[PDB]
Amino acid sequence: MIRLTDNRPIGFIDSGVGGLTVVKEALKQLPNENILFVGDTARCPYGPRPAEQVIQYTWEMTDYLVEQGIKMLVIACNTATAVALEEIKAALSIPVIGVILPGTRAAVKKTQNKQVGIIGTIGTVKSQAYEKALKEKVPELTVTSLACPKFVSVVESNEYHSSVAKKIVAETLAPLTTKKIDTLILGCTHYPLLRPIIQNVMGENVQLIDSGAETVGEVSMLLDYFNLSNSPQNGRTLCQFYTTGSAKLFEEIAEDWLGIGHLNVEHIEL
Amino acid sequence: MIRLTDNRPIGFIDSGVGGLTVVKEALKQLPNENILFVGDTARCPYGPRPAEQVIQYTWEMTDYLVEQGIKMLVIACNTATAVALEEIKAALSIPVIGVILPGTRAAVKKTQNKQVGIIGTIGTVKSQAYEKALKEKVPELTVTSLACPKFVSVVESNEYHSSVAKKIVAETLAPLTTKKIDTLILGCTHYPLLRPIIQNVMGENVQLIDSGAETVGEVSMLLDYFNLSNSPQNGRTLCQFYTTGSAKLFEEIAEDWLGIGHLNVEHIEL
């Protein structure tokens, strides 16, 4: 059993800053892995854009990180996952993972009464990506999908602990607390910052599924499958962030969400 | 996101009958997947044999199932996993999974005080496969490995619930109950049949890790990664067992362990 020590970094790409919560989970779950992240904030959001454009931009972020030396790629964007993941995965020689299926898989396992909910942006909800993936696994599931329009703004404004946040979450999820849902998927990478509030509003009897966290769980298994793990003797020595937009704003957001002090953020061009 | 419905079966190979517990877990965790299993009982055990021989026999079982149409391969044998997995995985175009790493991964996650134990045959223990894999992930772990020589005979004789079994397990594991071990890996596929007895002897404060069960957990993730899942509308329609030895004895063992009635067992030649 020849195990190879590979200290190349794992790459993460996103149109915006939401993917930072996926990196946060990677830092915790994969303590010995190096990390590279790109947030295409200069062109965020990708949702409204035609597929041709989304694929082009996602390829630009991908190419950038591949040239920086990544050994595996995590597409932390829902739109990029739904629109460009298949093409990129087929073309590259490195493993490529998206966020939707891992969360869906976890939800199917966690639910007991088969009443599953999923919250996310209106784009994610309207795409039906989660409902379809859930039903393709278990047709008997009763799936409730709910768009939460203002959640992203609250988190990106670093006000996810404010009175405004508690009010917005409480009022937005109200109709979701009367369907006997026992499993709720956080279908937007920004939502983990609002988890305490979401948990309180939904109740202790509701299991929340963090799709990004589940995605990192898949990465852990894939590192072993593809023989790409770094060693503990090496440990994490690199964690670099790149953004096509304001490095100042990106750093303000990143350092607040990750809560681990100073971070390395560099403005780049794609 | 183009999802492909693939009703081809998942294959499982083993030198003996131990791998049946891995199939048992697959039946439970993957209710919609078809299954094919080959037990090379006419040449069991592989352990004492030179690598050249082990690889040849494992390739024969592999070739047989590939020709039967499998879409993924699970090597449920420790010796085959340690000796032939790498070569077979590199050569085939289908995913190939072994049992050691999945269990090791689960153990590292479950342990809190870092006192991890692993029980298995003397061959598995002496190979240090588990200790090495565990240490490669977390060097600080204190790993205790213990061979349990008679466990296999008790299970293959379908006496895993007898007074003899309780006595054998109690006396064999005695020295393992005084090391503050909080996580114990069942490093032999026959051991799940003795789990209740093992749990009682170790104590409720000890988390047992079923390597075969963890391996099936990896399979679940890989079906999504490689887009090879069967659909729930199809469901499991096929579960066939093949053995190079006595079909009568194999069936006696299989039907007892699986406890789901009549099974399809066919004697074959490799």
Side-chain angles (χ1 to χ4, degrees):
Chain A
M1 303 175 81
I2 303 298
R3 286 285 89 189
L4 295 179
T5 293
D6 198 329
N7 74 334
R8 282 182 297 162
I10 295 176
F12 299 73
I13 60 177
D14 185 18
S15 59
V17 298
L20 285 171
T21 65
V22 183
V23 170
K24 192 173 183 181
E25 275 296 314
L27 294 173
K28 178 193 187 305
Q29 302 186 221
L30 306 167
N32 302 313
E33 297 295 332
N34 292 318
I35 306 294
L36 292 191
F37 176 96
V38 176
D40 193 16
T41 57
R43 296 184 299 202
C44 174
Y46 283 5
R49 305 173 183 279
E52 297 59 51
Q53 203 165 59
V54 174
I55 296 169
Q56 183 198 312
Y57 300 170
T58 303
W59 257 124
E60 293 182 1
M61 291 194 285
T62 297
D63 284 345
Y64 188 78
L65 287 193
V66 165
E67 299 181 307
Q68 290 312 310
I70 61 167
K71 63 184 178 189
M72 177 180 281
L73 179 67
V74 178
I75 298 180
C77 172
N78 283 337
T79 299
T81 292
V83 182
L85 171 61
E86 215 50 44
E87 183 181 315
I88 295 176
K89 184 176 188 176
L92 303 186
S93 289
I94 66 178
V96 182
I97 313 155
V99 291
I100 300 175
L101 285 185
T104 299
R105 186 184 315 132
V108 167
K109 178 178 181 180
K110 283 289 190 177
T111 187
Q112 298 303 79
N113 64 24
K114 310 188 76 61
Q115 308 310 296
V116 182
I118 179 276
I119 49 169
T121 63
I122 192 163
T124 292
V125 169
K126 289 299 180 179
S127 73
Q128 300 186 302
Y130 276 102
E131 183 181 2
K132 291 177 182 296
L134 284 166
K135 299 292 181 58
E136 294 180 318
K137 298 181 174 302
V138 182
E140 300 71 45
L141 298 177
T142 292
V143 183
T144 298
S145 300
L146 179 64
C148 303
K150 300 177 182 295
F151 286 18
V152 168
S153 66
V154 172
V155 181
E156 299 193 339
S157 300
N158 286 337
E159 297 289 348
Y160 51 84
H161 280 168
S162 69
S163 54
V164 175
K166 298 179 182 179
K167 174 184 169 63
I168 294 182
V169 176
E171 306 188 311
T172 300
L173 305 181
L176 201 64
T177 63
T178 60
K179 299 182 180 181
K180 300 178 180 181
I181 293 171
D182 72 355
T183 304
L184 177 64
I185 298 173
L186 300 186
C188 172
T189 55
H190 285 69
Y191 297 8
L193 277 308
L194 296 168
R195 187 164 181 161
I197 299 178
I198 292 173
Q199 188 68 75
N200 180 67
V201 174
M202 294 305 287
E204 296 188 301
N205 298 306
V206 180
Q207 290 294 310
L208 306 183
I209 300 297
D210 182 326
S211 285
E214 297 301 333
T215 291
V216 171
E218 180 174 305
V219 170
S220 179
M221 307 184 94
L222 295 175
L223 288 174
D224 281 340
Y225 186 82
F226 289 106
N227 204 359
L228 295 169
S229 297
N230 188 192
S231 67
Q233 292 186 294
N234 274 335
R236 178 198 315 128
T237 55
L238 169 72
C239 185
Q240 179 71 51
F241 301 85
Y242 309 102
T243 178
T244 52
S246 169
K248 176 58 192 305
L249 177 56
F250 192 95
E251 200 184 331
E252 285 175 48
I253 296 173
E255 306 195 331
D256 177 286
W257 291 15
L258 273 52
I260 59 179
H262 184 63
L263 299 176
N264 301 301
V265 181
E266 172 96 314
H267 167 79
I268 63 165
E269 296 179 56
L270 297 175
Chain B
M1 303 175 81
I2 303 298
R3 286 285 89 189
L4 295 179
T5 293
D6 198 329
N7 74 334
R8 282 182 297 162
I10 295 176
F12 299 73
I13 60 177
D14 185 18
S15 59
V17 298
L20 285 171
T21 65
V22 183
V23 170
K24 192 173 183 181
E25 275 296 314
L27 294 173
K28 178 193 187 305
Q29 302 186 221
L30 306 167
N32 302 313
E33 297 295 332
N34 292 318
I35 306 294
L36 292 191
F37 176 96
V38 176
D40 193 16
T41 57
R43 296 184 299 202
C44 174
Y46 283 5
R49 305 173 183 279
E52 297 59 51
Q53 203 165 59
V54 174
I55 296 169
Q56 183 198 312
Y57 300 170
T58 303
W59 257 124
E60 293 182 1
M61 291 194 285
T62 297
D63 284 345
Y64 188 78
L65 287 193
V66 165
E67 299 181 307
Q68 290 312 310
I70 61 167
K71 63 184 178 189
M72 177 180 281
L73 179 67
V74 178
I75 298 180
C77 172
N78 283 337
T79 299
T81 292
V83 182
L85 171 61
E86 215 50 44
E87 183 181 315
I88 295 176
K89 184 176 188 176
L92 303 186
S93 289
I94 66 178
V96 182
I97 313 155
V99 291
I100 300 175
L101 285 185
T104 299
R105 186 184 315 132
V108 167
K109 178 178 181 180
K110 283 289 190 177
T111 187
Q112 298 303 79
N113 64 24
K114 310 188 76 61
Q115 308 310 296
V116 182
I118 179 276
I119 49 169
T121 63
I122 192 163
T124 292
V125 169
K126 289 299 180 179
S127 73
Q128 300 186 302
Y130 276 102
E131 183 181 2
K132 291 177 182 296
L134 284 166
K135 299 292 181 58
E136 294 180 318
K137 298 181 174 302
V138 182
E140 300 71 45
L141 298 177
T142 292
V143 183
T144 298
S145 300
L146 179 64
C148 303
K150 300 177 182 295
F151 286 18
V152 168
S153 66
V154 172
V155 181
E156 299 193 339
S157 300
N158 286 337
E159 297 289 348
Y160 51 84
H161 280 168
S162 69
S163 54
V164 175
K166 298 179 182 179
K167 174 184 169 63
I168 294 182
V169 176
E171 306 188 311
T172 300
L173 305 181
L176 201 64
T177 63
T178 60
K179 299 182 180 181
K180 300 178 180 181
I181 293 171
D182 72 355
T183 304
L184 177 64
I185 298 173
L186 300 186
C188 172
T189 55
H190 285 69
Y191 297 8
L193 277 308
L194 296 168
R195 187 164 181 161
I197 299 178
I198 292 173
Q199 188 68 75
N200 180 67
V201 174
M202 294 305 287
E204 296 188 301
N205 298 306
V206 180
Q207 290 294 310
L208 306 183
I209 300 297
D210 182 326
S211 285
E214 297 301 333
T215 291
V216 171
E218 180 174 305
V219 170
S220 179
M221 307 184 94
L222 295 175
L223 288 174
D224 281 340
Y225 186 82
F226 289 106
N227 204 359
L228 295 169
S229 297
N230 188 192
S231 67
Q233 292 186 294
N234 274 335
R236 178 198 315 128
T237 55
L238 169 72
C239 185
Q240 179 71 51
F241 301 85
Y242 309 102
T243 178
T244 52
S246 169
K248 176 58 192 305
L249 177 56
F250 192 95
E251 200 184 331
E252 285 175 48
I253 296 173
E255 306 195 331
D256 177 286
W257 291 15
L258 273 52
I260 59 179
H262 184 63
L263 299 176
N264 301 301
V265 181
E266 172 96 314
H267 167 79
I268 63 165
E269 296 179 56
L270 297 175

